Design a protein around this ligand. Structure first.
Ligand code: 426
Length: 245
C-alpha cells in the first residue's frame, strides 16, 4: 500500500496472507486473498499461473505482521488450486484474473471463524456500487514503488470508483480496460494499492452490507496521475464461482 494507514488484522478479518516455500526452505510473501467461506479463498490467477504447484503455497488468516505469529492465527495449506481456464496477460491488462484456493489445515479441517477470522460476501448479480463510491483496499504491498521490501505491518487505505467511460478515455486505459474490470483511485493520486497487494480484497459498503466488489489486478505504476487501480468485477464471475465450488 502507498500512503494509507497501518492497521491490524482485527480490522480486515477476511484477509488471507499467501506465501510460498522455495526449493531450499526459505519462504516469501506472494499475494493477499479473501475468505469466501470456511473452506474457500478467492484471489488473482496471476499470483499463481507461473507456479501452479499447490503444495508450494502457504496461507494464513488472522495474521497482523509479515514475520510474526499473531495470537489467534491459523496456518493452512491449499487443498485445491483452481485458475480461470480462460486467463491471459496483455501489456497491462490481465484477463479473468480470478482464482480459487480450497484451504485445509494439517488436521484436514477448514477455517474456524473468530474475532479476527471472518468472511466477506460476494456482490449480487447486476448490482455494483455507483461510480465515485468510496471503498477500501488492504495488504502488505509496497509503500513506495522504489522500495524492494514489503512493509512489516498490515496497511489499508480508502479509494473511489471511476466509471467505465471515464476510465476508457485516452489518457487513462483506452480500450485496454474492459467491462469485466472496475477502476478505482485517489482523486489526488497520493495513495493507491501496489505490487504486493495483488489479489487483495476491495470491500465496498453497498446498500448497507460490506461487499467484496473487486480483486486487485493491475495498474500502470502506483499512485500515478490518471492511472487508476484496476480490479476484477466479482459480480460477473458469480456463475463461475458457484459451479467451481
Ligand atoms: N497501481 C496499482 N494499484 C497496482 C495494482 C497491482 C499491481 C501489480 C503488479 C505486478 O507486478 N504484478 C505481477 C506480479 C507477478 C507477475 C505478473 O504478471 C505475470 C502474469 C502473466 C504474465 C506475467 C504481474 C505491479 C504493480 C501493480 C500496481
Amino acid at each position: 500500500i502507498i500512503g494509507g494507514e497501518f492497521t491490524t488484522i482485527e480490522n480486515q478479518p477476511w484477509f488471507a496472507a499467501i506465501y510460498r516455500r522455495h526449493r531450499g526452505g526459505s519462504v516469501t510473501y506472494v499475494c493477499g486473498g479473501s475468505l469466501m467461506s470456511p473452506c474457500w479463498v478467492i484471489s488473482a490467477t496471476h499470483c499463481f499461473i507461473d507456479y501452479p504447484k499447490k503444495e508450494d503455497y502457504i496461507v494464513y488468516l488472522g495474521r497482523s505482521r509479515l514475520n510474526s505469529n499473531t495470537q489467534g492465527e491459523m496456518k493452512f495449506e491449499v487443498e485445491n488450486l483452481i485458475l480461470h481456464k480462460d486467463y491471459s496477460a496483455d501489456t497491462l491488462a490481465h484477463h479473468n484474473d480470478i482464482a480459487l484456493l480450497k484451504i485445509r489445515s494439517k488436521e484436514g479441517r477448514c477455517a474456524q471463524p473468530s474475532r479476527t477470522i471472518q468472511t466477506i460476501c460476494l456482490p449480487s448479480m447486476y448490482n455494483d456500487p455507483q461510480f465515485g463510491t468510496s471503498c477500501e483496499i488492504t495488504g502488505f504491498g509496497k509503500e513506495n514503488s522504489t522500495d524492494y521490501l514489503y512493509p512489516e505491518q498490515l496497511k489499508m487505505t480508502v479509494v473511489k470508483l471511476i466509471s467505465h467511460r471515464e476510465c476508457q478515455q485516452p489518457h487513462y486505459y483506452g480500450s485496454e480496460v474492459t467491462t469485466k474490470m472496475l477502476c478505482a483511485a485517489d482523486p489526488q493520486w497520493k495513495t493507491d494499492s501496489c505490487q504486493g497487494d495483488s489479489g487483495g480484497p476491495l470491500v465496498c459498503s453497498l446498500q448497507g452490507r460490506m461487499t467484496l466488489t473487486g480483486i486487485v489486478s493491475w495498474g500502470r505504476g502506483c499512485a500515478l496521475k490518471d492511472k487508476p487501480g484496476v480490479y476484477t468485477r466479482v459480480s460477473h464471475f458469480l456463475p463461475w464461482i458457484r459451479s467451481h465450488t
